Write an enzyme that holds these catalytic residues in place. Sequence first.
Site, PDB file in Angstrom:
ATOM      1  N   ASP A  25       0.796  -1.230   0.000  1.00 51.12           N
ATOM      2  CA  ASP A  25       0.000   0.000   0.000  1.00 51.12           C
ATOM      3  C   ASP A  25       0.829   1.282   0.000  1.00 51.12           C
ATOM      4  O   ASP A  25       1.397   1.657   1.022  1.00 51.12           O
ATOM      5  CB  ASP A  25      -0.892  -0.044   1.244  1.00 51.12           C
ATOM      6  CG  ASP A  25      -2.095   0.852   1.145  1.00 51.12           C
ATOM      7  OD1 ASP A  25      -2.062   1.847   0.392  1.00 51.12           O
ATOM      8  OD2 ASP A  25      -3.081   0.552   1.841  1.00 51.12           O
ATOM      9  N   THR A  26       0.863   1.973  -1.135  1.00 52.47           N
ATOM     10  CA  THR A  26       1.625   3.228  -1.241  1.00 52.47           C
ATOM     11  C   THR A  26       0.897   4.406  -0.590  1.00 52.47           C
ATOM     12  O   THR A  26       1.502   5.446  -0.331  1.00 52.47           O
ATOM     13  CB  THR A  26       1.954   3.576  -2.707  1.00 52.47           C
ATOM     14  OG1 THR A  26       0.739   3.743  -3.448  1.00 52.47           O
ATOM     15  CG2 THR A  26       2.790   2.477  -3.341  1.00 52.47           C
ATOM     16  N   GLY A  27      -0.392   4.229  -0.316  1.00 48.81           N
ATOM     17  CA  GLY A  27      -1.182   5.279   0.309  1.00 48.81           C
ATOM     18  C   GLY A  27      -1.217   5.196   1.825  1.00 48.81           C
ATOM     19  O   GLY A  27      -1.862   6.014   2.485  1.00 48.81           O
TER      20      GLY A  27
HETATM   21  C1  LIG Z   1      -9.440   4.693  -0.115  1.00 47.85           C
HETATM   22  C2  LIG Z   1      -9.235   3.234   0.114  1.00 47.85           C
HETATM   23  C3  LIG Z   1     -10.405   2.362  -0.343  1.00 47.85           C
HETATM   24  C4  LIG Z   1     -11.716   2.955   0.184  1.00 47.85           C
HETATM   25  C5  LIG Z   1     -10.249   0.903   0.167  1.00 47.85           C
HETATM   26  N1  LIG Z   1      -8.848   0.553   0.482  1.00 47.85           N
HETATM   27  C6  LIG Z   1      -8.330   0.656   1.705  1.00 47.85           C
HETATM   28  O1  LIG Z   1      -8.921   1.198   2.640  1.00 47.85           O
HETATM   29  C7  LIG Z   1      -6.885   0.148   1.869  1.00 47.85           C
HETATM   30  N2  LIG Z   1      -5.890   1.110   2.353  1.00 47.85           N
HETATM   31  C8  LIG Z   1      -6.389   2.477   2.251  1.00 47.85           C
HETATM   32  C9  LIG Z   1      -5.244   3.462   2.248  1.00 47.85           C
HETATM   33  O2  LIG Z   1      -4.386   3.209   1.128  1.00 47.85           O
HETATM   34  C10 LIG Z   1      -5.856   4.844   2.125  1.00 47.85           C
HETATM   35  C11 LIG Z   1      -5.133   5.967   2.850  1.00 47.85           C
HETATM   36  C12 LIG Z   1      -5.882   7.272   2.596  1.00 47.85           C
HETATM   37  C13 LIG Z   1      -5.440   8.400   3.471  1.00 47.85           C
HETATM   38  C14 LIG Z   1      -4.236   9.050   3.227  1.00 47.85           C
HETATM   39  C15 LIG Z   1      -3.807  10.083   4.046  1.00 47.85           C
HETATM   40  C16 LIG Z   1      -4.586  10.476   5.125  1.00 47.85           C
HETATM   41  C17 LIG Z   1      -5.795   9.834   5.378  1.00 47.85           C
HETATM   42  C18 LIG Z   1      -6.215   8.801   4.552  1.00 47.85           C
HETATM   43  C19 LIG Z   1      -5.097   5.671   4.357  1.00 47.85           C
HETATM   44  O3  LIG Z   1      -6.054   5.128   4.919  1.00 47.85           O
HETATM   45  N3  LIG Z   1      -3.986   6.025   4.997  1.00 47.85           N
HETATM   46  C20 LIG Z   1      -3.843   5.816   6.450  1.00 47.85           C
HETATM   47  C21 LIG Z   1      -3.244   4.523   6.905  1.00 47.85           C
HETATM   48  C22 LIG Z   1      -3.531   3.222   6.524  1.00 47.85           C
HETATM   49  C23 LIG Z   1      -2.835   2.164   7.100  1.00 47.85           C
HETATM   50  C24 LIG Z   1      -1.846   2.424   8.062  1.00 47.85           C
HETATM   51  C25 LIG Z   1      -1.568   3.739   8.437  1.00 47.85           C
HETATM   52  C26 LIG Z   1      -2.270   4.780   7.854  1.00 47.85           C
HETATM   53  C27 LIG Z   1      -2.158   6.262   8.079  1.00 47.85           C
HETATM   54  C28 LIG Z   1      -2.844   6.854   6.906  1.00 47.85           C
HETATM   55  O4  LIG Z   1      -1.887   7.094   5.869  1.00 47.85           O
HETATM   56  C29 LIG Z   1      -6.870  -1.102   2.755  1.00 47.85           C
HETATM   57  C30 LIG Z   1      -8.057  -2.002   2.539  1.00 47.85           C
HETATM   58  C31 LIG Z   1      -9.175  -1.918   3.369  1.00 47.85           C
HETATM   59  C32 LIG Z   1     -10.299  -2.700   3.139  1.00 47.85           C
HETATM   60  C33 LIG Z   1     -10.313  -3.587   2.071  1.00 47.85           C
HETATM   61  C34 LIG Z   1      -9.207  -3.692   1.237  1.00 47.85           C
HETATM   62  C35 LIG Z   1      -8.087  -2.901   1.476  1.00 47.85           C
HETATM   63  O5  LIG Z   1     -11.454  -4.339   1.854  1.00 47.85           O
HETATM   64  C36 LIG Z   1     -11.732  -5.012   0.634  1.00 47.85           C
HETATM   65  C37 LIG Z   1     -12.107  -4.031  -0.469  1.00 47.85           C
HETATM   66  C38 LIG Z   1     -13.277  -3.150  -0.065  1.00 47.85           C
HETATM   67  C39 LIG Z   1     -13.719  -2.251  -1.211  1.00 47.85           C
HETATM   68  C40 LIG Z   1     -12.556  -1.463  -1.803  1.00 47.85           C
HETATM   69  N4  LIG Z   1     -11.944  -0.534  -0.834  1.00 47.85           N
HETATM   70  C41 LIG Z   1     -10.709  -0.050  -0.939  1.00 47.85           C
HETATM   71  O6  LIG Z   1      -9.937  -0.368  -1.852  1.00 47.85           O
END
Ligand SMILES: CC[C@H](C)[C@@H]1NC(=O)[C@@H](NC[C@@H](O)C[C@@H](Cc2ccccc2)C(=O)N[C@H]2c3ccccc3C[C@H]2O)Cc2ccc(cc2)OCCCCCNC1=O
Lengths: 99, 99
Positions: A25-27
């Site tokens: 995860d790059t985000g």
């Molecule tokens: C925006 C992300 C979208 C909504 C979601 N992906 C994530 O949340 C995935 N990671 C999201 C991050 O890349 C987004 C990113 C957005 C952001 C950036 C800066 C400030 C606030 C928010 C974040 O949360 N970042 C936070 C984070 C995450 C992990 C650890 C530390 C931190 C700190 C902060 O950077 C993980 C995941 C969760 C459920 C999943 C699959 C994967 O279920 C399965 C899939 C469900 C449907 C698809 N959902 C996704 O792909």
Amino acid sequence: PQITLWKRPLVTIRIGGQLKEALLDTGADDTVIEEMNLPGKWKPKMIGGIGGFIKVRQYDQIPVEIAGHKAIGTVLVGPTPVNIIGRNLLTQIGATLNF
Amino acid sequence: PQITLWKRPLVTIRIGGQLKEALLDTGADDTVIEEMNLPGKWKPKMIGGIGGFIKVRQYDQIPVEIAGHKAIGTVLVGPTPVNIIGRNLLTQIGATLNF
Ligand SMILES: CC[C@H](C)[C@@H]1NC(=O)[C@@H](NC[C@@H](O)C[C@@H](Cc2ccccc2)C(=O)N[C@H]2c3ccccc3C[C@H]2O)Cc2ccc(cc2)OCCCCCNC1=O
């Protein structure tokens, strides 16, 4: 290795002697792994993403092997939907985004 | 270009005639843009991330230029703290992870 993004960039990692699947995860600023028993003292912490804030257990200097590459850094343990490898460990293995 | 991960991978994008700063996110299945008045029909949706779910509006076939790379696809508009360019659009600009 070069990883395209047609599918989720899920790779096999090795932590605490256990093999697990994690999302590159790059985000994500940090690395968050699903609840498990990790050796050593941990500090309670709160991280936030999309949807809200969650409480995690912070472990420091944890050795993690990502696709054969070694990294030693901070690993957060908590109620996460999926194991996430964030920028803190991605930079250690020299991962970059290319296009 | 080649983007290192020491800092958040933020780039300039063009959506609906406006230039915005968005995060290249390999961990996001979809693209989520901060609240903006996009014209057209949309479909309500709930996306789940770290701390839970948020309601968004789904717009299809929206043209988004990422750092000079023309792409077009589904864009979710909602109360996100930051613009997120997901895999649906990253695959279109030929983005890959390398290490
Ligand atoms: C925006 C992300 C979208 C909504 C979601 N992906 C994530 O949340 C995935 N990671 C999201 C991050 O890349 C987004 C990113 C957005 C952001 C950036 C800066 C400030 C606030 C928010 C974040 O949360 N970042 C936070 C984070 C995450 C992990 C650890 C530390 C931190 C700190 C902060 O950077 C993980 C995941 C969760 C459920 C999943 C699959 C994967 O279920 C399965 C899939 C469900 C449907 C698809 N959902 C996704 O792909």
